[PDB]
Write a protein that binds this ligand. Structure first.
Ligand SMILES: NC(=O)c1ccc[n+]([C@@H]2O[C@H](COP(=O)([O-])OP(=O)(O)OC[C@H]3O[C@@H](n4cnc5c(N)ncnc54)[C@H](O)[C@@H]3O)[C@@H](O)[C@H]2O)c1
Ligand SMILES: CC(=O)N[C@H]1[C@@H](OP(=O)(O)OP(=O)(O)OC[C@H]2O[C@@H](n3ccc(=O)[nH]c3=O)[C@H](O)[C@@H]2O)O[C@H](CO)[C@@H](O)[C@@H]1O
Length: 303
């Protein structure tokens, strides 16, 4: 048992993770059914299984020591329109963890999200805070966590760790998320869309930092649940500001607010710091946005 399998491994976090592990000398399998088109063609990320997580089989796992489960439907606003489709997130986790148990896979990292906290009543938000999902997507991640929790309580393989990602951004991320949306809109429309008043706040972490942290989990005991966030929040307006510092001509296009909007996500990082320590560096928001925008600038206008 030596291979790493990454579900969602053609997508934004999973593709970067796959590339870093292959760059490190690891034997990597990516599993991804390409149900959303990847920004970056999958080439170079290892053996590729182009199927749903639900079609994973025993033999796909037979030499696998570690799984990163990152395959998800991940859109908060769209989950209000296709709520039943989001049940696939629960089905897939139930299937994956069942198969890992029957085969004896040693470790699984399960991707979850700060959205399971809803609007938390404790800021910064610690991992023991209760669950208050405000969308069908968030509800589906709560379901996925419940499945993983049962495996955590069971005294059988895999060791299962839940990672609650806060907002991750960077090159390669599709433009339905804030930073890339703003970039893609700034470039094709000279517009910076703001949904609602823009006072709502998110905790942003740059993709390379998140990948470094995920890799640090490959060779340490997994915490049952850990926040991956920066520990600081910024308003949508703060991000807008940073971009207009770059493009003063940009027009802010007011959009309609989201339903059940969350005013602030902010990670408590004490557990993260303890389990995986912290490195000096890390990409600040100014630089991260710039690197993201530059990446978008190297994309052909049609995009
Ligand atoms: N990006 C963030 O800002 C962020 C924040 C919090 C949580 N997360 C979580 O991180 C993970 C990865 O997010 P991302 O931004 O890379 O998304 P992504 O859309 O870029 O990648 C997910 C990949 O999974 C594939 N996929 C989805 N469902 C699948 C299924 N059941 N079977 C096979 N392939 C499937 C998609 O085709 C895609 O390439 C998800 O678990 C997501 O919920 C991401
Ligand atoms: C698409 C995506 O990656 N979603 C992830 C993102 O959700 P989340 O919904 O926070 O991410 P978004 O980037 O979609 O939205 C962030 C904020 O910016 C606003 N907005 C967005 C786009 C825009 O062009 N203008 C604008 O003002 C939104 O209303 C929201 O208030 O982080 C979550 C953790 O918190 C994850 O669970 C989600 O999977």
């Amino acid at each position: 048992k030596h291979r790493i399998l990454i579900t969602g491994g053609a997508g934004f976090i999973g593709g970067h993770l796959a590339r870093a592990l292959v760059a490190s000398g690891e034997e990597v399998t990516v599993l991804d059914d390409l149900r959303v088109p990847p920004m970056i063609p999958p080439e170079g990320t290892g053996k590729f299984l182009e199927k749903p997580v639900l079609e994973l089989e025993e033999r796909d796992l037979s030499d696998v020591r570690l799984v990163y489960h990152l395959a998800s439907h991940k859109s908060v606003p769209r989950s209000f329109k296709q709520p039943l489709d989001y049940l696939d997130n629960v089905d897939s986790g139930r299937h994956l963890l069942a198969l890992c148990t029957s085969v004896g896979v040693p470790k699984v990292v399960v991707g979850s999200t700060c959205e399971v906290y809803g609007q938390a009543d404790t800021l910064p938000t610690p991992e023991d805070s209760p669950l208050s999902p405000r969308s069908p997507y968030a509800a589906s991640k709560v379901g996925l966590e419940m499945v993983a929790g049962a495996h955590q309580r069971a005294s059988v393989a895999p060791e299962v760790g839940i990672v609650r990602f806060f907002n991750v951004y960077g090159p390669g991320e599709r433009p339905d998320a804030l930073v890339p949306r703003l970039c893609a809109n700034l470039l094709t429309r000279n517009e910076l869309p703001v949904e609602g008043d823009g006072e709502q706040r998110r905790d942003f972490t740059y993709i390379t930092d998140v990948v470094d942290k995920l890799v640090a989990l490959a060779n340490r005991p997994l915490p049952s649940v850990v926040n991956f966030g920066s520990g600081q929040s910024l308003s949508v307006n703060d991000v807008i500001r940073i971009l207009q510092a770059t493009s003063p001509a940009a027009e802010v296009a007011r959009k309609q607010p989201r339903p059940n909007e969350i005013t602030e996500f902010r990670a408590d990082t004490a557990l993260q710091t303890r389990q995986i320590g912290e490195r000096s560096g890390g990409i600040g928001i100014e630089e991260g946005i710039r690197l993201t925008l530059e990446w978008w600038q190297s994309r052909d206008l049609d995009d």
